[PDB]
Amino acid sequence: MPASLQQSSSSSSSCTEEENKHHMGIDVIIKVTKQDQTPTNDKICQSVTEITESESDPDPEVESEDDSTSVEDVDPPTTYYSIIGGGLRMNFGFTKCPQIKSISESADGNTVNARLSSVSPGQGKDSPAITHEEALAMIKDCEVSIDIRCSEEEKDSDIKTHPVLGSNISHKKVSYEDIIGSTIVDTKCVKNLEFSVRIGDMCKESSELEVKDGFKYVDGSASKGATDDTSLIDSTKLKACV
Amino acid sequence: APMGSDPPTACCFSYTARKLPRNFVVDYYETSSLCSQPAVVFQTAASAQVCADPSESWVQEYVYDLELN
């Protein structure tokens, strides 16, 4: 009975009370349809590999940073991920975008989905908050890349019976902001591919701080279109891959 | 050695807005041609590959630099 009480002001305990502050997070749902050729593969949440640039300037791995001074002028690193599963290998590089703390996945039929997003305050995980200035600044530079490939690792699934932590944000229709960067897809194992992203407050929408983007990939046919990606996938069948 | 039928390929769909300093660019590669909308792709250190519009000078200068050293 942890009576230690997680304080209250903690960004992890609850939302802040500083009007000029918001809990900026991110949500990136994705639905991919397998080709009628690819073999069966339900083994989802096979594994996940988190990586990040040398960041700051602790010890550049053989000239991996500025190679010289590194105060705080400019030095934006990229967080990469390689969530394997569903016979597919999905990877994305978040640059200057909220820190993802929630990773889930699931399989249904000949398609597989993946929920990549940040955690809302009061979930047991950090969820920093900043001012509108830094918010508008981030939502602008924030860019996420993608590069799916055909896997074959028949390894087992590594999940946790612990419910998936949501960002409390909905993929409704709102201001359009080009956040999705490059998107490489090997037809060899991906017929369709829907992209949906969002960035805003995890406590309460703020319109200006709310934005969205996405595309529709079908049989090699792409198409930009801001639509209600709220039902794009069943947020219930999601499973934390740890 | 009969080439495949007509299997689509990787063709830039969108470019990154933020330019990644050379420090995070050890190599690069170009899309293809089967798509009348090519572009230049650059590699990094903690990512993989990311397309880039060749319409921006810095993208060209970056390529010219990798062509030499």
Swiss-Prot record, chain B:
Q: Coiled coil where?
A: none
What are the cysteine partners in each disulfide bond?
Answer: C11-C35, C12-C51
- Its name, as the record gives it, is C-C motif chemokine 4
| Species whose genome carries this gene | Homo sapiens
Q: What stretch of the parent protein is included here?
A: 24 to 92 of 92
